[PDB]
Amino acid sequence: RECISIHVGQAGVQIGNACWELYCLEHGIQPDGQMPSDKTIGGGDDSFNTFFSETGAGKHVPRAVFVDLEPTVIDEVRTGTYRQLFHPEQLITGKEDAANNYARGHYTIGKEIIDLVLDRIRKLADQCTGLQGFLVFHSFGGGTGSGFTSLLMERLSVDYGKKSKLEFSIYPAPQVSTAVVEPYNSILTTHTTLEHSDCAFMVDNEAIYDICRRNLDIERPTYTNLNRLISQIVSSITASLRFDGALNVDLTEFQTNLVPYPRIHFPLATYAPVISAEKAYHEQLSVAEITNACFEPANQMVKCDPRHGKYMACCLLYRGDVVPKDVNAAIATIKTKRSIQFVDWCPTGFKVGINYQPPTVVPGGDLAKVQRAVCMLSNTTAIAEAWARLDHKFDLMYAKRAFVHWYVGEGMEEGEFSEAREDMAALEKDYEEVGVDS
């Protein structure tokens, strides 16, 4: 049951790079594609084969497509450490980018490159015997990441109607953002993509930035830092697809376990522990401590306050030295001290998965090796706070029609702005209906 990864725009590509580097480290795959521990040469249907195909010469090749409308970012993949991992058809670049303009990525340029992308994706699909769907990595804020991604999602729904689609989306933050129009792009892409995505993991760059500042003691985090952290979270989420396990073994299960209502499909991710490599000796956090840390806003991928929302589903994904008894003990403890309210029509429970292999880190990196870690995926109404933030920024510019002429000049209509914003307003109201009392 294969899984295809699609990385769109700079954020999607660089995070993709980080993730596949990490995947290779975790499965014992070298930069040249060889995998010594793999005794079946030229094929097999092991778990890691969900993400890697095999050549007759024993090369293990990522089931991935990289797409960017300019070439500078993907060129670094082409000439980088893991260049031998990929075939050139997997790496697609145009000559000029979307200029931070959703409409330019979706309409003007998207129309010219979408079929090429679909063809390359189809080539990967043909290899698959039982494809389950796609993992799509992109920023909210970029012209390509927003516009082209939304176009691509529409077309993927058309060409693979059965398949599941999962999103990993970088929500825009003023600290590391690029464009002043990123709220616009975010609302436009969320509106166009909402029907076509089964489960979306938002990562607020603000949260990652502060985690890097606070716990890694990095004064001014770079994209490399952010991406190594993010890749740790992504690996936690996809480990169940790549390894033997019983929890979340196919893309459909993410939808089944985390999303009771289709529009409300943005689970909050929380990760612990994030410990600095520079710290020579560490106090190893116990199951109780990392599980408790999962309910601290300072460890969330999106800053918000789950105490003032309601849960619809909670998932705990441990890696390393963890046994069920310890988890149940810790959960017992945490219930009595924490504000954890579920909606009345959902069971108050946790789905737990434990992978015995402790997390892997990039050598000479900023993250320390720890003996146990946990990523919590919880669908809480609290994440609507992020939408409220974004929509407000949108409302501020749109009231004056600031920058709108750049979008209209690309063939988009002004009406799409208000259509998208109305959809977001509906989304917020949905969150409030599910989560708020009188």
Binding site: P174, E206, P297, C304, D305, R307, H308
Partner: protein, 348 residues
């Protein structure tokens, strides 16, 4: 130069706070919608907590605790006291109360009948979190009239036992209530303003007539409006702690601290410590402080009863200057330092 914004033009307390901040010369007020602020003096309703703490390079403070409404709405206060392990359902300082929707109707009726058969006093009061300024309150010893009154309204009500044996000030044989101001800062320290106020009735207490709600309702507005003896005994029907302590000494051979304030400090502590895990901002991306107004009754046994908690209290005029200065000292400058405490810190 710190910056702040004002989003509640109706708050007397924070009008004064704002004035003081400006007068320090180190605070600048911005237009209410400018996001680049250090301090938000927020609006009473739908305060956008979700937008706080996302401004790079700005430590941000707001004058409200998200979640504190649980204490400051009557229905939700009843529910909180009845369902919180830390506050016994049998907790002794809160008057037997029931939440009724225009629901604990049958429960209330059951207790009521139990009281009727046992010859006991059965005078209850109906009040709406909805109702305001003494409007929508009914005191009756018949359940039927209360429920009829509630059903004619549109929002949730509470039926709570009337305290038929209140402590009466002499002369005048008159009722009163106690207002305490409590400031909770960003570290969740609990500061009780040393100065409380007694809001008194200027009419003789009459248990044979609960329809005349003048000597039954302490409310300053109600006394100022309907009482023709308003201000006869004390100015603005407000007695302060120096005089009240002296009265307790002369009349009952006891002090305000021993007979009453121990109980009050206990109740304040219990309530705030109860919800601390739910509303604390110690690890949040923004920080909260808030001024509360606790309102108490004292019965003839010198027992203290919590009546209600107010999330946006006004102050007694003569006290505005001091308290407000205190707010700037411990709640604001503590976070944003400028270039003999009036508060009792309630430890925990």
């Amino acid at each position: 130069m710190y910056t702040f914004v004002v989003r509640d033009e109706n708050s007397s307390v924070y009008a004064e706070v704002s004035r003081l901040l400006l007068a320090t010369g180190q605070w600048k007020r911005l237009r209410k919608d400018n996001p680049r602020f250090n301090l938000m003096l927020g609006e009473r309703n739908r305060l956008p907590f979700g937008r706080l703490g996302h401004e790079p390079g700005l430590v941000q403070l707001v004058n409200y605790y998200r979640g504190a409404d649980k204490l400051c709405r009557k229905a939700s206060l009843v529910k909180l006291i009845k369902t919180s392990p830390e506050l016994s359902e049998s907790c002794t300082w809160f008057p037997e109360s029931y939440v009724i929707y225009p629901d604990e109707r049958e429960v209330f009726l059951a207790a009521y009948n139990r009281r009727r058969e046992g010859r006991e006093g059965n005078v209850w009061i109906a009040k709406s979190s909805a109702g305001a300024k003494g409007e929508g309150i009914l005191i009756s010893s018949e359940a039927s009239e209360l429920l009829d009154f509630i059903d004619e309204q549109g929002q949730v009500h509470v039926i709570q036992k009337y305290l038929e044996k209140p402590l009466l000030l002499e002369p005048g044989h008159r009722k009163f209530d106690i207002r305490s101001w409590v400031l909770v800062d960003h570290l969740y320290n609990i500061y009780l303003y040393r100065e409380g106020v007694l809001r008194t009735s200027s009419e003789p207490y009459n248990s044979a007539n609960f329809q005349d709600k003048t000597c039954h309702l302490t409310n300053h507005c109600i006394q100022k409006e309907y009482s023709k003896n308003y201000g006869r005994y004390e100015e603005g029907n407000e007695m302060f702690f120096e005089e009240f302590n002296q009265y307790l000494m002369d009349a009952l051979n006891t002090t305000l601290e021993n007979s009453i304030l121990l109980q009050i400090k206990h109740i304040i502590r219990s309530c705030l410590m109860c919800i601390e895990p739910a509303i604390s901002t110690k690890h949040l991306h923004y920080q909260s402080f808030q001024l509360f107004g606790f309102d108490f009754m004292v019965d003839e046994e010198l027992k203290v009863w919590l009546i209600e908690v107010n999330g946006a209290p006004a102050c007694a005029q003569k006290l505005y200057a001091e308290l407000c200065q205190g707010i700037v000292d411990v709640a604001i400058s503590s976070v944003f330092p400028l270039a003999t405490s009036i508060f009792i810190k309630l430890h925990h």
